[PDB]
Amino acid sequence: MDKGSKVRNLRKESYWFNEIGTVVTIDKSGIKYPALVRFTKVNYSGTNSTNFSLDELQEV
Amino acid sequence: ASYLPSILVPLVGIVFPGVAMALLFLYIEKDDI
Amino acid sequence: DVAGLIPCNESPVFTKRLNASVVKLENRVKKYEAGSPPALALEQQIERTKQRFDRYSKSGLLCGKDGLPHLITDGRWSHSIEFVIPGLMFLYITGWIGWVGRKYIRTVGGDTNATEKEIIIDVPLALKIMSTGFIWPISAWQEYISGTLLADVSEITVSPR
Amino acid sequence: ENFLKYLSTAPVLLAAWMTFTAGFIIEANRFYPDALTFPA
Amino acid sequence: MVTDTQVFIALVLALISALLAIRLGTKLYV
Amino acid sequence: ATKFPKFSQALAQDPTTRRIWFGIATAHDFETHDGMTEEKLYQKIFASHFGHLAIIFLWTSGNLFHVAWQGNFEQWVLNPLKVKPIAHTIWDPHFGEPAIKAFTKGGAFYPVNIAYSGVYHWWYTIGMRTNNDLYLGSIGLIILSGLLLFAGWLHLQPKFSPSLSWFKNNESRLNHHLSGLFGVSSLAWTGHLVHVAIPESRGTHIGWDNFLTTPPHPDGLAPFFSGNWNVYAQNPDTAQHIFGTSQGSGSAILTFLGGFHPQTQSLWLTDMAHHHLAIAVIFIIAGHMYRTNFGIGHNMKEILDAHRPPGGRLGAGHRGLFDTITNSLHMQLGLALASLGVITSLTAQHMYAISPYAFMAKDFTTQAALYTHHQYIAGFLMVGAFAHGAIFFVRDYDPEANKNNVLARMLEHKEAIISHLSWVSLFLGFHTLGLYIHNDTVVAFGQPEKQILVEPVFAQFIQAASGKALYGFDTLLSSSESPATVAGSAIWLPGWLEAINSEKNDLFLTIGPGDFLVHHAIALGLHTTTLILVKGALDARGSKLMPDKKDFGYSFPCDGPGRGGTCDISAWDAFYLSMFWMLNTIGWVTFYWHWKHVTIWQGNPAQFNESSNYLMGWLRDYLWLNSSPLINGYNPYGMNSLSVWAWMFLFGHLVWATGFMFLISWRGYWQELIETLVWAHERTPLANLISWKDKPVALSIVQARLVGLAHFTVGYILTYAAFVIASTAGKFG
Amino acid sequence: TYWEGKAPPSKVLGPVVSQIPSPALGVISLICLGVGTYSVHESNIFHTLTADTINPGYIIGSLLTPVAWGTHVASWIQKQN
Amino acid sequence: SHAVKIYDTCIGCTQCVRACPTDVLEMVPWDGCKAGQIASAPRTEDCVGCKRCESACPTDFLSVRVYLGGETTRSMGLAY
Amino acid sequence: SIVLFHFSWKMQSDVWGSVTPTGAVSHITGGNFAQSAITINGWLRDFLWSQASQVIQSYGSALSAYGLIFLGAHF
Amino acid sequence: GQLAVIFLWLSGMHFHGAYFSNYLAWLNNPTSIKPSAQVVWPIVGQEILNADVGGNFQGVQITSGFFQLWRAEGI
Numbered sequence A: 001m002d003k004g005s006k007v008r009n010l011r012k013e014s015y016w017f018n019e020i021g022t023v024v025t026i027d028k029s030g031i032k033y034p035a036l037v038r039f040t041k042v043n044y045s046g047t048n049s050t051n052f053s054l055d056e057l058q059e060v
Numbered sequence B: 001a002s003y004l005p006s007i008l009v010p011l012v013g014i015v016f017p018g019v020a021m022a023l024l025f026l027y028i029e030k031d032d033i
Numbered sequence C: 001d002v003a004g005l006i007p008c009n010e011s012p013v014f015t016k017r018l019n020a021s022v023v024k025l026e027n028r029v030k031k032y033e034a035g036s037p038p039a040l041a042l043e044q045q046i047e048r049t050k051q052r053f054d055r056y057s058k059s060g061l062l063c064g065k066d067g068l069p070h071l072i073t074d075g076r077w078s079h080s081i082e083f084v085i086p087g088l089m090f091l092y093i094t095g096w097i098g099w100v101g102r103k104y105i106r107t108v109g110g111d112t113n114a115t116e117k118e119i120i121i122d123v124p125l126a127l128k129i130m131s132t133g134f135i136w137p138i139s140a141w142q143e144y145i146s147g148t149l150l151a152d153v154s155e156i157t158v159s160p161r
Numbered sequence D: 001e002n003f004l005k006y007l008s009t010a011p012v013l014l015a016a017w018m019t020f021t022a023g024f025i026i027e028a029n030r031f032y033p034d035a036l037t038f039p040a
Numbered sequence E: 001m002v003t004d005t006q007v008f009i010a011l012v013l014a015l016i017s018a019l020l021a022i023r024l025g026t027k028l029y030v
Numbered sequence F: 001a002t003k004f005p006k007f008s009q010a011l012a013q014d015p016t017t018r019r020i021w022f023g024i025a026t027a028h029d030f031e032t033h034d035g036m037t038e039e040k041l042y043q044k045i046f047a048s049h050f051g052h053l054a055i056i057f058l059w060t061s062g063n064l065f066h067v068a069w070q071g072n073f074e075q076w077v078l079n080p081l082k083v084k085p086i087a088h089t090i091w092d093p094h095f096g097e098p099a100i101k102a103f104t105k106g107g108a109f110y111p112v113n114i115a116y117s118g119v120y121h122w123w124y125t126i127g128m129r130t131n132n133d134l135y136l137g138s139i140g141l142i143i144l145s146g147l148l149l150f151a152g153w154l155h156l157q158p159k160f161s162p163s164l165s166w167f168k169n170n171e172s173r174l175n176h177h178l179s180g181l182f183g184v185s186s187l188a189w190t191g192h193l194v195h196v197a198i199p200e201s202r203g204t205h206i207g208w209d210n211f212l213t214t215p216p217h218p219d220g221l222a223p224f225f226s227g228n229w230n231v232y233a234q235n236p237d238t239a240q241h242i243f244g245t246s247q248g249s250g251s252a253i254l255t256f257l258g259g260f261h262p263q264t265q266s267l268w269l270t271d272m273a274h275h276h277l278a279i280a281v282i283f284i285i286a287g288h289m290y291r292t293n294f295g296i297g298h299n300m301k302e303i304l305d306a307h308r309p310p311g312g313r314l315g316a317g318h319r320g321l322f323d324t325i326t327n328s329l330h331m332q333l334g335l336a337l338a339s340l341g342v343i344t345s346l347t348a349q350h351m352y353a354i355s356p357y358a359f360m361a362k363d364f365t366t367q368a369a370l371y372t373h374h375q376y377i378a379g380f381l382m383v384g385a386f387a388h389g390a391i392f393f394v395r396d397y398d399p400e401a402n403k404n405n406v407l408a409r410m411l412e413h414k415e416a417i418i419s420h421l422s423w424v425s426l427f428l429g430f431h432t433l434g435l436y437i438h439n440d441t442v443v444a445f446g447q448p449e450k451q452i453l454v455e456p457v458f459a460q461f462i463q464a465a466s467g468k469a470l471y472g473f474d475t476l477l478s479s480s481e482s483p484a485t486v487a488g489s490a491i492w493l494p495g496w497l498e499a500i501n502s503e504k505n506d507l508f509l510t511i512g513p514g515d516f517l518v519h520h521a522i523a524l525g526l527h528t529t530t531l532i533l534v535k536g537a538l539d540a541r542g543s544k545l546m547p548d549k550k551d552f553g554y555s556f557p558c559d560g561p562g563r564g565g566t567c568d569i570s571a572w573d574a575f576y577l578s579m580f581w582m583l584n585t586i587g588w589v590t591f592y593w594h595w596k597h598v599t600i601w602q603g604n605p606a607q608f609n610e611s612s613n614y615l616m617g618w619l620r621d622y623l624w625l626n627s628s629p630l631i632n633g634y635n636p637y638g639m640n641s642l643s644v645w646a647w648m649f650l651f652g653h654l655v656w657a658t659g660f661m662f663l664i665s666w667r668g669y670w671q672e673l674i675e676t677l678v679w680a681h682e683r684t685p686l687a688n689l690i691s692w693k694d695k696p697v698a699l700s701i702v703q704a705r706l707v708g709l710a711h712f713t714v715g716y717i718l719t720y721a722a723f724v725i726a727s728t729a730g731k732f733g
Numbered sequence G: 001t002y003w004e005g006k007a008p009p010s011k012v013l014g015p016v017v018s019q020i021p022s023p024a025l026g027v028i029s030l031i032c033l034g035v036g037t038y039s040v041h042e043s044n045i046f047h048t049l050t051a052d053t054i055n056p057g058y059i060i061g062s063l064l065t066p067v068a069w070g071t072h073v074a075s076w077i078q079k080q081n
Numbered sequence H: 001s002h003a004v005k006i007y008d009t010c011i012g013c014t015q016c017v018r019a020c021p022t023d024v025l026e027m028v029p030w031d032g033c034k035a036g037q038i039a040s041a042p043r044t045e046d047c048v049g050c051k052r053c054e055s056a057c058p059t060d061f062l063s064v065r066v067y068l069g070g071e072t073t074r075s076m077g078l079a080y
Numbered sequence I: 001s002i003v004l005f006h007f008s009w010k011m012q013s014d015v016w017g018s019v020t021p022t023g024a025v026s027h028i029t030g031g032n033f034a035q036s037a038i039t040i041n042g043w044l045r046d047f048l049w050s051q052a053s054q055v056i057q058s059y060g061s062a063l064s065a066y067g068l069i070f071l072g073a074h075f
Numbered sequence J: 001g002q003l004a005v006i007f008l009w010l011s012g013m014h015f016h017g018a019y020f021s022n023y024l025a026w027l028n029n030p031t032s033i034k035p036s037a038q039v040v041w042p043i044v045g046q047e048i049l050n051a052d053v054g055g056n057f058q059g060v061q062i063t064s065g066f067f068q069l070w071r072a073e074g075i
C-alpha cells in the first residue's frame, strides 16, 4: 500500500506465508509484482525479500 | 519317477535359463517392434 | 501383593542375592592384608552393599521370582513412591526449564540482534529469568487463560496447510 | 568486558552449566547412593 | 506311491496350462 | 514400439542401459503407459489378476505334488511326533558324498529337505490321509489354474471385455464378494469340515466315492429342519480321544467346547465347523446390504454424504469420499493392503497362541517359521498401504472435490499430526533406550538389584480378565462371583479356563518386566515407522522446501543442491526410509517371540525373565548362544544337515553388506569410474571388435536407492530365516 | 444427501421411515428397547444360557436393540422437523 | 530432454542465464518487469538437468523451474 | 579391520601361548588358524563368535566397562 | 599449540604413573603384576572397574606400555 507499511503475506507458495513483512518499494510503473517486501526471517536460500502483487498482500 | 529330476533339473537350471536369456537379449536390443 | 509379587522383606532369593554379593566381595578382599587401602575400599563396598539391600528391604518394594525389586506404575498410591512422586519432580524441573527457556526466547526476541543474543547469552537477564521458574505452573496457566500462551492461526504454514 | 562476553558464549556456558549439573547430581548420588525409590 | 502314469498325466495337464499361460501373456499385448 | 519398452517412448529413445533398467521397473505402472485410457487400464488389471490367481494355484499344486511324490506323508500321519515332514528331494550335482549322506533323513533313500511350512499338519487336520488325496488335489488345482489362465485370456477379447461401468459397480461387487466370496465360501468350508475333516479325524474314511451315502451325522438333517439343532452338539469327542481313530470318538458336528484337543493340543474340529458356519451366516446376511437393481438396499454415496456431524468439528464430513475412492485405484489399493497387513499380523498372533492344526505347537521350527513369515509379510503390506496412499495423494487427490472434507482436513492440520507423532516417537525412544542402558549399566557394575524392572500391570490385568488365575487380580472371569463368568460358565468357560490356566500352552504367556520393555520398544518402532510413512504421504503434495512437489510426481531423485540441498525429498524416499524402520521393528518383534518361545521350550523360562531387562542379555543369551548349532553347520571336522542353513546365513550377511554399497556411495563416483571403463574398452585391440549396443551408465539415484534397499531386505530376511530355522532345528528349541 | 445445519433431511431415513411421524417412531423405539433389553437380561444374565436354552425369541429381541437405537435417532430427526 | 519453464514472477536479473553451463537459457525483451527482460529456454535439448539455474534464482520460489524427463545422449552428460 | 583381525588371530593361534619346562608349546587357540582361516564361516565362528566370549561375559567383573563400550560402539 | 597439548598429555601420563600407579610393585615383579595407572572414584558402583591388578593396588589396567618404556629408561 505504502512505503514502510507492514503487510501480511498471502502467497501460498511463499516461504513467508501468513507472515508480516515491511514494504520497501512500490513500483507505480505498471509491473505484475510491483510491491517489494522484506521479512525478518531468511528463507532456505538466504534471501529475506520478494516481489508481490498488491492482491497477494493483506494490508495493515 | 526317480529318473525325472536328472532329466529336468539340468533343463530348468541351464537350458531353460540359457534359451530364455538368449531370447530376451535378442528382443531387448531388436531395435524394431 | 499386586501381580503375584511377594514383598522383598520376606524374599529368600533377595537374601540369597545379598549373601552372594557379600561373599564375593569377601573372597575378593581375602587377597589383601587387613588395613590395606584396597582392603578398606572393599570393606566400604561391602558396607554400602549391605546398606543398599537393607534400604530396599525396608522401603516396601515388591520382589519377583528372580528376587529383584519390581515397580508398580498403575497409579497405586501405596506404590506412588516408585514412579508418581519422582515423575512429578521431573515434570516440575523440566517444566521450570522449559518455561524459563520460553521466556528468554520471548524476551530477547524483540531486538534487532535477537540471533546474536542466542549464541551469546545475556547472563544477567538469563539469571533474572531463570530465578522465576519456581512458579512456572501458575504463570503458564495464567498465560493460557489470558490468550498469551498460543499463537493465532495466522502463522507460517505450507501449501496444503 | 571482552573476556566476560566470551564467557557468555553458548558453548562455554553450556559446558559450565552441564559441569555444574553433573557435579551436583554426582554429589547427590554420593550422599544418598542407590536411590531407586523415595524414602517413606 | 504315485505311479509313473500319474506323474505323466500331471505333466500333460501342466503343459496344457503352460500353453494357456503363453497365450494369456501374449494377449496382454505389451 | 521402436525399442524394448513400448509403454514409454521416452525410455525407448534412451540410448543407455537405463532404458533396460527402467523398462523393468515401469512395466506394471499401467497408468503411465503411453496411450493408456481408463477402460484399458481396468481391463489389463483384471487380466493381470487372473494371471496372478493362476500363479498362486500352480504354486499350491506344486506343493501338493511334491509332497505326494517325494514326501513321507503316510509315514508322518502314522507317527506325526517323531518323524520329520519332507518337502522335496535334493538333486544337486554339486553335492559331495558326505553331503548326500548327511541330508538323507526322514524316509531316506534320497537326499531330502525337511519341510518347515507346516503344510503337513494342515493337510492332516483337514482330513487328508494318503498321497492319492494330495495328488488329486494337485491335479484339481492345475486344472483350476488352466481355467483361470483361459478366463484371463477370454476377458481380453473385444466382445468379452467388461465395460468401465462394470468395474465401478461398487454395490454389486461388495454384495457378491461379501455373501458369495466370503460367506458361501465359508459355508462350503464348514460343509467340508462336517463331511470330511471330522469323520476323517474319527477314523472314518470319507471320499468322493462314498461321501454321498454316509451322512456326517446319524440323524441327518432331521434336527436341522425340525429346529432341534442341539442334537448336533450332543455327544462330543471325550478328552480320551486319539485323533484320527475311533478310540474315544464322539458324534457331534457343531459344538462350542473351547480349549484344545488334549491329544493334539489344537482346536476341536467341531468348534472350527461351528465357527465357520456362524461366520458364513453373518457374511451372507451382510452381503444383502447394498442395492443392486432390486430396489432394496443401501446406496453408499448417500451414506458417505450423510455422515457430517452438525457440530461441524469434521467440517463437511465425508462428502466427496465416494467419488475419490471409486475413481482412485491407489486409495482402495492402499486400504486393501492395510487391512490385509492387519489380518496377516492377526494370523501370526493367533496361530501361535491358539493352535488350529493337529500336532502343531510341538513342531517348534514350523511355528517359528510361520510366525516370522506372516509378521514380515504384514510389515511389507503395511508399508505398501502407506506408499500407495502417498501415491494417491500425489496423482489421485483432487483438492477442489474434497473442499472442507474430512480427507482435506487431514492435510489442513498435517503439522500437528507429524509433530505429535515425532514427540511420541522421541518420548518412547529416549525413555525405553534409557531404561535398557540403565539396566545394562547397573548389571555391568555387579548390582542387578538396582535395575528398573517395571511390572506390566495392564497386560497382566487383561490376562486375568480372560481367566488367568496366576496374578491374583480376582477380576471378571478370574473371580467366580462375577456376571461374566457365571453367564459364560455353561457354554465355553470350562474348556477356555482349563486351557488358559495350563502353562503347557501359548495361550497368554506369563509376562514380566522384559515383556514390558520389549512391548514399549515395539510401540516405538510402530510409531516411528508410522511417522515416516505419514510424513511422506502428507508432504507428498508439497512442503516449504518444495511447495510444488506434486508437479514432480511420486518418485523423483531430488530438486538439486539449491536452497540447502534436497536429497531424499520425494514421497518415494519416505517409503524407502520407512522400509528400514519396518524391517527393524519386525526384527524386534520376531526376536522377542523367538527368544521367549525358545526359553519356554528349553524348560527354563527364567532365563528370558532374567536376561531380557538389559541389552547385553539379548546379545549374549539369544544371538551368541543360539547361533552355535548354526555356525557349526560345516566345520573342518565335517558337516551335518544344517550346512545349507549356515551357508544361507553367510549369504544373507553378504547381501546385507552389499546393500550398503548402493546406500552409502552415490552415483557421481560410479559414473566417473564407468567413464574410464568405457575408455579402456574402446582402446583395447581384439576387444574393439565387440561393442556395446546400449551405452553403459551408472545406476540412477532412485534406482540405486531401490537396489540398495532390495539388497538390504533380501540379506536381512535370508540371514534371519537361516538363524531362526537352524537354531530351532539344531537344539530342538 | 449431504446436509448442513442441525437436523438432517428426512430422506436420510429412507423411503419408509422418512414418512413415519416422530411420536410413532418414539413409541416403537421404546417398545423395541424394552423387548431387547428384557430378552438379553432373561437369558445370560438372569438365567445362564446352556445348549438347550437357546430361545429364538430372545435372539430376535436382542437383535432388536440396534433397531431401537436407529428408531430413536430417526424419531429425533423427525422431531426436529 | 528436460523441460525448462520460466514464470512471470521473474525479475530478469540474468543470474540463471549466467549460471547455465550448456547455454540453454537466454534473455529476451519483456515489459512485465522493471528490467524489461525475461529468461527463456529456447534450446532445452542441451539441458543436462543440473538445476544450477534454480539455485541461482533470487525470486521467492524459482521463477525458473526444471522438470526432468526423457534422457538423451546430450541430457545424460555422456561424452560417448 | 581385516589387517587387525589377521594379526590378532594369527598371534593368538600361532605365537602367543605358554611353554612347559620340557619345551612343549600350547597356544591360546590351539593353532586353529591353518584349517579355519580359509573360509568366511571359519572367521565368523572361530574368531568373532569364539573370541567374543570375554566381552559378552565381562559383566560383573573389572572388564564390564569393555562390555558396556562394546554395546555402545555397536549403538 | 599442538606441541603444548602433546606436552600436557605427556605430563598427565607421567604424573598418573607417579601418583596413581603401581609402577614400583610392577618393577619388583614385572611378570605377575599387571600394569595400571588409572583409578576410578567410587560414585555409582564403578569402583568394580578397579581391577585386582596386584601389588596391593587396585586400578584400571593400562595397555599403553608406559611401564615398559619407563623401565627401559631406568626410572
Ligand code: CLA
Pocket: F045, F046, F049, F050, F053, F166, F167, F169, F170, F172, F173, F174, F176, F177, F179, F180, F181, F182, F185, F343
Ligand atoms: C459370488 C460371486 C463372486 C465370486 C465368488 C467372486 C470372486 C472373486 N472375484 Mg469377483 N465379482 C463379482 C462376484 C464374485 N467375485 C461381481 C458381481 C463383480 C462385479 C462388480 C465382480 C468383479 C470383480 C473384479 C473387477 C475383480 C474380481 C476379483 C475376484 C477374485 C478376488 C481375488 C481372490 O482370489 O479372492 C480371494 C478369496 C478369498 C476367499 C480370500 C478371502 C479374504 C480373507 C481375508 C482370507 C481369509 C481366509 C482364511 C481365514 C485363511 C485360511 C486359509 C488357508 C488355510 C489357505 C475372486 C476370485 C478380482 C480378480 O482377481 O479377478 C480374477 C478382480 O479384479 N471380481
Ligand code: CLA
Pocket: B004, B005, B006, B008, B009, B012, E007, E010, E011, E012, E014, F055, F058, F059, F060, F061, F062, F063, F065, F066, F088, F089, F090, F091, F142
Ligand atoms: C510353482 C510350483 C512349483 C515349484 C516351485 C516347483 C519346484 C521344483 N520342482 Mg516341481 N512341479 C510342479 C510345481 C512346482 N515345482 C507341478 C505343478 C508339477 C506337475 C507337472 C511338478 C513336477 C515336477 C517334476 C516331475 C520334477 C519337479 C522338480 C522340481 C525342482 C526342480 C525344478 C525343475 O526341474 O522343474 C521341473 C518342473 C517342470 C518341468 C514343470 C513346471 C513346474 C511348475 C508347474 C512351473 C510353475 C511356474 C511358476 C508359476 C512361475 C513361472 C515364472 C518363471 C518362468 C520365472 C524344484 C524343487 C524336479 C525335482 O524334483 O528335482 C529334484 C522334477 O523332476 N517338479
Ligand code: CLA
Pocket: C097, C098, C099, C100, C101, C102, C104, C121, C126, C127, C129, C130, F419, F420, F422, F423, F426
Ligand atoms: C527452551 C527451549 C525449548 C522449549 C520450550 C521446547 C518445547 C518443546 N519442544 Mg523443543 N527443542 C529445543 C528446545 C525447546 N523445546 C531444542 C534446543 C531442540 C533441539 C535438540 C528441540 C527439539 C525438539 C524436537 C525434535 C521436538 C521438540 C518438541 C517439543 C515439545 C514437547 C517437549 C519436548 O519434546 O521437548 C524435547 C526437547 C528436546 C528434544 C531437547 C531439549 C534440550 C534442552 C533441554 C532445551 C533447551 C534449553 C535451553 C538451554 C534454554 C536455556 C534458557 C536460558 C538461556 C535462560 C515442546 C513444545 C517435540 C514436539 O514437536 O512436540 C509437539 C519434538 O518432536 N523439540
Ligand code: CLA
Pocket: B008, B011, B012, B013, B016, E018, E021, E022, E023, E024, E025, E026, E027, E028, E029, E030, F005, F007, F023, F024, F025, F027, F028, F033, F044, F048, F051, F052, F055
Ligand atoms: C504375478 C506375476 C506377474 C504377472 C501376472 C505379470 C503380468 C504382466 N507383466 Mg510383468 N513382471 C513380473 C511379474 C508379473 N508380470 C516380474 C517378476 C518382472 C520382472 C521384474 C516383470 C517385468 C515385466 C516387464 C518388463 C513387462 C511385464 C509385462 C507384463 C504383462 C504381460 C507379459 C506377458 O505375459 O507377455 C507374454 C509373455 C509370455 C507368454 C511368457 C510367459 C512365460 C512362460 C509361461 C514361461 C514358461 C517356461 C517354463 C517354466 C519352461 C520350463 C521348461 C523345463 C522343462 C526345462 C502383464 C501385465 C509387460 C507389460 O504388459 O508391460 C505393460 C512388460 O513390458 N512385466
Ligand code: CLA
Pocket: F024, F025, F026, F027, F028, F029, F030, F333, F337, F380, F381, F383, F384, F385, F387, F388, F391, F554, F555, F572, F575, F710, F714
Ligand atoms: C497387490 C498389491 C500391489 C499392487 C497391485 C502394486 C502395484 C503397483 N505398485 Mg505397489 N507396493 C505394494 C503392493 C502392490 N503394488 C507393496 C506391498 C509395497 C511395499 C513394498 C509397494 C510399494 C510400492 C512403491 C514404493 C511404489 C509402488 C509402485 C507400484 C506401481 C508400479 C510397480 C512396478 O512398476 O513394478 C516394478 C517391479 C519391480 C521393480 C520388480 C521388483 C521386485 C522386487 C523388489 C525384487 C525382488 C528380488 C528377489 C526377491 C530376489 C531373489 C532372492 C534370491 C537372490 C535369493 C504399480 C501400480 C510404484 C509407483 O509409482 O506406482 C504408481 C512405486 O513407486 N508400490
Ligand code: CLA
Pocket: F422, F423, F425, F426, F427, F428, F429, F430, F433, F528, F531, F532, F577, F578, F580, F581, I075
Ligand atoms: C541404532 C540406530 C538408530 C537410532 C538410535 C536412531 C534413532 C532415531 N531415529 Mg533413526 N534411523 C536409523 C537408525 C537409528 N535411528 C537408520 C539406519 C535409518 C534408516 C536410514 C533411520 C531413519 C530414521 C528416520 C527416517 C526417522 C528416524 C527417527 C529416529 C528417532 C526415533 C525416535 C527416538 O528414538 O527418539 C530418541 C532418540 C534416540 C534414541 C537417539 C539417541 C539419543 C541418545 C541416547 C542421546 C545421547 C546424548 C549424549 C549426551 C550425546 C553426547 C555426545 C558427545 C559425547 C559428543 C531417533 C532420533 C525419526 C525421528 O526423527 O523422530 C523424531 C525419523 O523420522 N530415523
Ligand code: CLA
Pocket: D012, D015, D016, D019, J008, J009, J011, J012, J013, J015, J016, J020, J038, J039, J040, J041
Ligand atoms: C592431560 C591428560 C590428563 C588426563 C586425561 C587426566 C585425567 C584424569 N585425572 Mg589427571 N592430571 C593431569 C593430566 C590428565 N589427567 C596433569 C597434567 C596433572 C598434574 C596437575 C594431573 C593431576 C591429577 C590429580 C592430582 C588427580 C587427577 C585425576 C584425574 C581423573 C579425574 C579428573 C576429573 O574429572 O576431576 C574433576 C575435574 C573436573 C570437574 C574438571 C573441572 C571442570 C572445569 C571447571 C570446566 C571448565 C571448562 C570451561 C568452561 C571451558 C572454557 C575455558 C574457560 C576456562 C575460559 C582423570 C582420570 C584425579 C584422580 O584420578 O582421582 C583418583 C586426581 O586425584 N589428575
Ligand SMILES: CC1=C(/C=C/C(C)=C/C=C/C(C)=C/C=C/C=C(C)/C=C/C=C(C)/C=C/C2=C(C)CCCC2(C)C)C(C)(C)CCC1
Pocket: F330, F331, F332, F334, F335, F338, F342, F385, F386, F387, F388, F389, F390, F392, F537
Ligand atoms: C496413507 C493413506 C491411506 C492409508 C492409511 C492407512 C494405512 C491407515 C491404517 C489404519 C489402520 C491400520 C488402522 C488400524 C485400526 C485398528 C483398529 C481400529 C482396532 C480396533 C479394535 C477395537 C476398536 C477393539 C477391539 C476389542 C474389542 C472388540 C473390545 C475389547 C478389546 C478388544 C481389543 C478385544 C489411505 C489409503 C486411506 C489414503 C489416504 C492416505
Ligand code: SF4
Pocket: H006, H010, H011, H012, H013, H014, H015, H016, H017, H038, H039, H053, H056, H057, H058, H059, H062, H063, H064
Ligand atoms: S535467475 Fe530467476 S529471476 Fe534471475 S533472470 Fe533467471 S529466472 Fe529471472
Ligand code: SF4
Pocket: H004, H019, H020, H021, H022, H023, H024, H025, H046, H047, H048, H049, H050, H051, H052, H053, H054, H066
Ligand atoms: S538445469 Fe542446468 S543446463 Fe538446464 S537450464 Fe538450468 S542451469 Fe542450464
